[PDB]
Amino acid sequence: MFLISWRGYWQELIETLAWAHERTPLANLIRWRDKPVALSIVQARLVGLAHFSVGYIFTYAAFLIASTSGKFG
Amino acid sequence: NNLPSIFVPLVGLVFPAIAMASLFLHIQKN
Amino acid sequence: SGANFARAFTV
Amino acid sequence: SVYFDLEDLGNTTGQWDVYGSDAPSPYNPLQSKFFETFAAPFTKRGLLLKFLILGGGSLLTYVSATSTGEVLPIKRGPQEPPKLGPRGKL
Amino acid sequence: EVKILVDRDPIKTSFEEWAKPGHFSRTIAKGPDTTTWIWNLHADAHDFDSHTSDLEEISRKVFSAHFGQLSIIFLWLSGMYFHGARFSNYEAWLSDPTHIGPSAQVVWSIVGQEILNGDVGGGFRGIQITSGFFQIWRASGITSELQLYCTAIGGLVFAALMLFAGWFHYHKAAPKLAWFQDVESMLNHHLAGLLGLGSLSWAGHQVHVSLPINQFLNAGVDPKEIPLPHEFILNRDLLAQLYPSFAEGATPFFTLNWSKYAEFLTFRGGLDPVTGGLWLTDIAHHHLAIAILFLIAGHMYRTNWGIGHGIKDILEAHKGPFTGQGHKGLYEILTTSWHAQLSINLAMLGSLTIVVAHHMYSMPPYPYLATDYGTQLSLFTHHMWIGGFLIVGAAAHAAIFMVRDYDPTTRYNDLLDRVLRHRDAIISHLNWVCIFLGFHSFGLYIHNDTMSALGRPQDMFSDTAIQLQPVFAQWIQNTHALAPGTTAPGATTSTSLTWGGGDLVAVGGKVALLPIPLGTADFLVHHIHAFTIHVTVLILLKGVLFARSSRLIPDKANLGFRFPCDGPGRGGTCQVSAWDHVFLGLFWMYNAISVVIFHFSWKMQSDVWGSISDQGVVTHITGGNFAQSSITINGWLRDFLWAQASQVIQSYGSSLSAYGLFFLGAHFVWAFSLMFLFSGRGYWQELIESIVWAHNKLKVAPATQPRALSIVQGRAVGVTHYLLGGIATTWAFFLARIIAVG
Amino acid sequence: MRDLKTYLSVAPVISTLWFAALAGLLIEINRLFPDALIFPFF
Amino acid sequence: SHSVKIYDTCIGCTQCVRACPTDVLEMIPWDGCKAKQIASAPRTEDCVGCKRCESACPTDFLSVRVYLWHETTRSMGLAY
Amino acid sequence: TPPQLDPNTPSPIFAGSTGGLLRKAQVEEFYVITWNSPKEQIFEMPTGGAAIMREGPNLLKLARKEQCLALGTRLRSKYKITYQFYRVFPNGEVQYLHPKDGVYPEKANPGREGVGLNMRSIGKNVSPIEVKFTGKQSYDL
Amino acid sequence: DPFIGSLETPVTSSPLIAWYLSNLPGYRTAVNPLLRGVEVGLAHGFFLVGPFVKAGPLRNTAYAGSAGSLAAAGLVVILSMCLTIYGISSFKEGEPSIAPSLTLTGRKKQPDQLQTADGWAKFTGGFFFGGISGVTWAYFLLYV
Ligand code: CLA
Ligand code: CLA
Ligand code: CLA
Ligand code: CLA
Ligand code: CLA
Ligand SMILES: CC1=C(/C=C/C(C)=C/C=C/C(C)=C/C=C/C=C(C)/C=C/C=C(C)/C=C/C2=C(C)CCCC2(C)C)C(C)(C)CCC1
Ligand SMILES: CC1=C(C/C=C(\C)CCC[C@H](C)CCC[C@H](C)CCCC(C)C)C(=O)c2ccccc2C1=O
Ligand SMILES: CC1=C(C/C=C(\C)CCC[C@H](C)CCC[C@H](C)CCCC(C)C)C(=O)c2ccccc2C1=O
Ligand code: SF4
Structure with a gap:
């Protein structure tokens, strides 16, 4: 997700979602304090890298421990 | 003994709820 | 069917 | 066909409450009096927050601790005899 | 009114333009200063709308490109037929279809690749094919190789004719603009002529040639003893013995007592027990009905005469509850821009291909097709991929039209x-x-x-x-x-x-x-x-x-x-x-x-x-x-x-090793695509700078200065490699598994 | 004839002829000498 | 708000002023070149950071530079 | 030049769209663009769709400066029409924004001050180590 | 006003729809927030009781009703905590309300007192009381 898709599409999506939330009844009594914006570029790259590393590490750890513990030899 | 039955819910639910409430209040506070 | 296969191995 | 003026900006930028109603209260006066009398202690904000947090924590901890083994499988404990490991380990 | 309008020799055939590249665009035509120029010369090759602005040149170029594409398709069909005729075991498969695997490709014996010549059966060695061509040929009535040779020769001749027609229509007689914008005549001819007459003629072939030969084949007769198809036409006795109704000739049809033709035009439906396919009588009946319907429906639009209907009148006069005035300026939009027509046609073709795949796996229309699992799997997957790609392309062309061909001043549409x-x-x-x-x-x-x-x-x-x-x-x-x-x-x-x-x-x-x-x-x-x-x-x-x-x-x-x-x-x-x-x-x-x-x-x-x-x-x-x-x-x-995946990976040393090799290659390409998908241009440019310094140190620097690929080119390369790798992986896995176990 | 030669001198056509000739030479060498893992001439 | 700085290498070709989509830059008379004019950036608080001005600038290295800085509602381009 | 006013100008003919003003218009600000058209003609709105501008003075409300400038430059390029836009706050203050000197910025005019001019090449800036532990920046000097 | 970011459609502005939406407890203005909160809480608790008692982990045992009612009560408590946190973080104490002061006709009207610290506090207290009452009433009705 974060490593391929980039910002502009998501910013437009957030634009539309903000309009939708502002125009609906019984839900416009609640208002946001911080204007929602899409993530920056460097932040998105960092998040994608973190996801990549976490998945890599967890998958290999699970495989190694399970495969070595199954036979104990 | 039965310490886990008392301690696990506290760390799992009550303390994160208190932390989230306090942090949100401090973040939004002017 | 043999001749068709042999056509490839003529040389 | 004029849609802008400077004297009053309320209608210029569209500050309307589309579905606001100003009718008097239709609730029964006795019902309102009873509910107002019995809902007084929860009006304050900080006191309500502290009471909610403390009571929720205490109640959840008490229910979790007191609960027997029929409701919770983890409180029943193991029943079948233990089994050995792959290479004869215990 | 409706007439033929042409221009004589708009362009002259000369080799002078071939010498210099990029003649269509001036900025390309100036000359190469960096490598990017090369990458541009292929990106705008078929952007006919941006080379010029006149509609006439664009239409003529489109016509010529269509003719070239038709020639290529005919050449491909001729090649397939010739391969079926020469290097194949069709005659062996004809007698015993259940225990013989189709094969029409033979590998040479150059390096050690001769192990790819697996033993499909029937005294033959070759690569098993999964195109389903053998079932098509059997259902068509072909029982020899001379007929396939003649078909291949005819296909080659048709390809040559299409190429000549394309050259003639672009360089000698080019139709004028008013000729193209006559959509009523185009629709009339495409409905009544292309779709009605073609299906009627195919129904004629099925009634006259395919039905008796397939009856003889299903009866258990040897393929080499079946009479030739023209003997059925010449001899009425054979047809009368096979079908008594033909003994009456064409008299019943003109007399409106069509029940006499109920022998070979039925309505049973279902599957034929012998071959597990649809009854050929039902297919011929359906083709005849379709021909009648299309011939009737092709006479709706007014062309050059009093009768008919006007497309503009139909669009403008339609008043409805939800639409209203609605469709008013749609006629100009759809007759002025090519991109809108391309988008609509692409969407329709993609949906049609998907529906074709569904219906074809649901009811097998060819004999001995249902029991062939590899053919069914390959056909379904291929057709669905094609449909998806076309449906995706429709949106891109709609976006192109909305960007570069939309103005609300001259042409205004209410619904849009x-x-x-x-x-x-x-x-x-x-x-x-x-x-x-x-x-x-x-x-x-x-x-x-x-x-x-x-x-x-x-x-x-x-x-x-x-x-x-x-x-x-x-x-x-x-x-x-x-x-x-x-x-x-x-x-x-x-x-x-x-x-x-x-x-x-x-x-x-x-x-x-x-x-x-x-x-x-x-x-x-x-x-x-x-x-x-x-x-x-x-x-x-x-x-x-x-x-x-x-x-x-x-x-x-x-x-x-x-x-x-x-x-x-x-x-x-x-x-x-x-x-x-x-x-x-x-x-x-x-x-x-x-x-x-x-x-x-x-x-x-x-x-x-x-x-x-x-x-x-x-x-x-x-x-x-x-x-x-x-x-x-x-x-x-x-x-x-x-x-x-056991059959794919354990195919080494056997006749399916190419599938494992492609299985690994697709993985390599898929991993390669991420290199373009994840990184950026500036790093590569800065690395090329040092490489260029190392080159210039030895007096071997080129005149066309190297340049890193542009952003859009990088994204396109990444997506192309990703899709190719994934599709090839699935292809190898499916084919290996279903050939091994099916 | 000048422009025909000029077009046949363009990069893709010259490249494909050169690579086809090289592939033919390699193929013929591999056919004449079936397989070899070392250089036994010397 | 970002920071837009004009250096003295400018030659006054008026391209950066035309390229700006928010009306940030303008030109003033000068005497350091042949064209006798230079650029200036009074309305910096309106800059959105699009860096269109830097794209159209003929010089060995750009004579107008945009440095991104603290963001705000106007510079971020929020319509809500 | 003295800034003008926009008392009671009418508006172009429109059917309505969902790309109009939002809560920010009531809360923070909006912009008002005024021009003069010699004939009633159809143009294309920045928000989306097509509208019709009347003869005489025309006035429009928008949410950002970019939309106003894009519409104005389209008017200048295609219709040859002068335009001017202001910024309006919830308090009623009106600020004149487009040409402040009465002349478009692409043309030089005496009486304009120089802002943010560095009298050196872009490669004469000091290194970040020189400005460390202070609030100023290298390009600011 | 066409240039406002909204459209007039049969569903958005219809007599039946406007009448129905203008009578809901969350849209009254002259009523003090406590009663409206009580009504909203009653409705929400009575609605919420069901799914917990029907699809919980103990739906097949004899402890379905009590466990489901307790879960619904916990959800009500959590929602009350969220409402209190939002009210604390959003509205200030002494500032006036921020509700619109004029209707579609343009006739001026008193601003709603819900968008204030005390008003929101009353609303949250009423919602908590109503939710608890609705949960216990649903439990009493279902298993008696
Ligand atoms: C980190 C620690 C943690 C702990 C200790 C629990 C504990 C529990 N989970 Mg939760 N959960 C967690 C994290 C945790 N969860 C996360 C991260 C997720 C997201 C995946 C979930 C999603 C989840 C689901 C989807 C479900 C649970 C359920 C359960 C309960 C199952 C016990 C039982 O058999 O039901 C016995 C029967 C009951 C209904 C118990 C009723 C009494 C409850 C606990 C309320 C007591 C009220 C109290 C006042 C709550 C307010 C205090 C507030 C501060 C929280 C138990 C309370 C199940 C459940 O309770 O269903 C509603 C269930 O379906 N959990
Ligand atoms: C995506 C859908 C999904 C769904 C439907 C379910 C469903 C279920 N889960 Mg599973 N689960 C999921 C994803 C999902 N799960 C995920 C992602 C995880 C993390 C791994 C789990 C992990 C999990 C655990 C750990 C447990 C369950 C269990 C259960 C049950 C408990 C449900 C519950 O009590 O809350 C329902 C609560 C409600 C308040 C319902 C709200 C929705 C209402 C009906 C909306 C209707 C709206 C309205 C009609 C719209 C128009 C309004 C108009 C009328 C005005 C239920 C059968 C529990 C169990 O064991 O059950 C057998 C359990 O312990 N789940
Ligand atoms: C009844 C006669 C008739 C027929 C049969 C066709 C059929 C066809 N037209 Mg249409 N067309 C017609 C009338 C006709 N048209 C008229 C009057 C106009 C002007 C309004 C057009 C305008 C038109 C355009 C602008 C285009 C087509 C195209 C096509 C081809 C689509 C490809 C295909 O579907 O494969 C079906 C495969 C086959 C049937 C091919 C076999 C060869 C056929 C039978 C040749 C005989 C057809 C021809 C009309 C008669 C010869 C005329 C000449 C000898 C004097 C196909 C050949 C498209 C095309 O592919 O470009 C060339 C294309 O771009 N047509
Ligand atoms: C029905 C036929 C069809 C037709 C006639 C067109 C026509 C047009 N397209 Mg559209 N398009 C279609 C279908 C079609 N499209 C589909 C299905 C898609 C979805 C992918 C698209 C998506 C699309 C995009 C994204 C773009 C166009 C654009 C264009 C125009 C420029 C063409 C170009 O320059 O390429 C010249 C030729 C090439 C660049 C060839 C590229 C090589 C391909 C991608 C490789 C395929 C790999 C191969 C199969 C693998 C073998 C491996 C081996 C070689 C080692 C042209 C008018 C372009 C535009 O700018 O329009 C103005 C453009 O940007 N089209
Ligand atoms: C597994 C896939 C993959 C592969 C193969 C590569 C390959 C490479 N990486 Mg890349 N990379 C990848 C993924 C991959 N990367 C990913 C996921 C990232 C994270 C974004 C990067 C980021 C990255 C960086 C940051 C850098 C590289 C660089 C390099 C090069 C290192 C030098 C070397 O290994 O040369 C070995 C060369 C090869 C294995 C290339 C393949 C050779 C082909 C197969 C030969 C052509 C043969 C055949 C005839 C093809 C015909 C095509 C057909 C159309 C006719 C090399 C091109 C480094 C560099 O550029 O060094 C100079 C470097 O700076 N990579
Ligand atoms: C889908 C597809 C495909 C296929 C296709 C096909 C199969 C087609 C067919 C087609 C057809 C199948 C067609 C047909 C046509 C026909 C026609 C066109 C006809 C005509 C006729 C005529 C013209 C006649 C005339 C006459 C005479 C002679 C006699 C009588 C009178 C008259 C005048 C009528 C393929 C695989 C390639 C691939 C791609 C896609
Ligand atoms: C999905 C996506 C978004 C949209 C993503 C958004 C708006 C983030 C939404 C986050 C929600 C609130 C869920 C957060 C879930 C986490 C568990 C919460 C954070 C936890 C840490 C603080 C510990 C981008 O903005 C973007 C920008 C540039 C390149 C790629 C992308 C991209 O891929
Ligand atoms: C690898 C890579 C490059 C560098 C890629 C380059 C330079 C392509 C190189 C293609 C070939 C291999 C160069 C040589 C081509 C000649 C035709 C060779 C002629 C000689 C014989 C071999 C025929 C980018 O420029 C880039 C830009 C933006 C995002 C991602 C990337 C990216 O990932
Ligand atoms: S970055 Fe964009 S908005 Fe800022 S001065 Fe340059 S052109 Fe104008």
């Missing part, structure tokens, strides 16, 4: 403006429905996995714990099962055996068709299909709608259809062009098609295909574990990807 004025509501509702559908559909699988891992199999969404049955589909199946008795008095049996109820049909010890049950797994998989389709639609529709202008960029039309970004400001504005939306939607189309083909393959291998014994029991390929193991992601990873 009304759609444009409230795009936010459309996008918001589509986003909500996508989120809701995906959340539920994938949360069901995640919940199943979590309850499985915790030792709680009684809290699943399964066939035993909590049931979600597709009641509507079951009701439709029951109604179709009960239809032939009451709803269809003419039809003797059901339209297809897929509907529940009926009897198993098997040919030569192999199951051909049986009713397909529906349970919880089908419910979940269909909802996943809906989710993926909705997300792809959302991406493409957003890209099309927000092409002209957006809240972030109020002047996105000036920048154009293909611009990488607008800048680091506004928080970042990468990938705002419609081209980037198409590039993003390609991945989701790939995801949806992959999931659908996986579902089809597993369901068919589990609950339909298999083997039948003399006693009567049926043993399926995978033991029917789809109904209980496909409700968890672990089940899809273990019982499907892990179990069915």
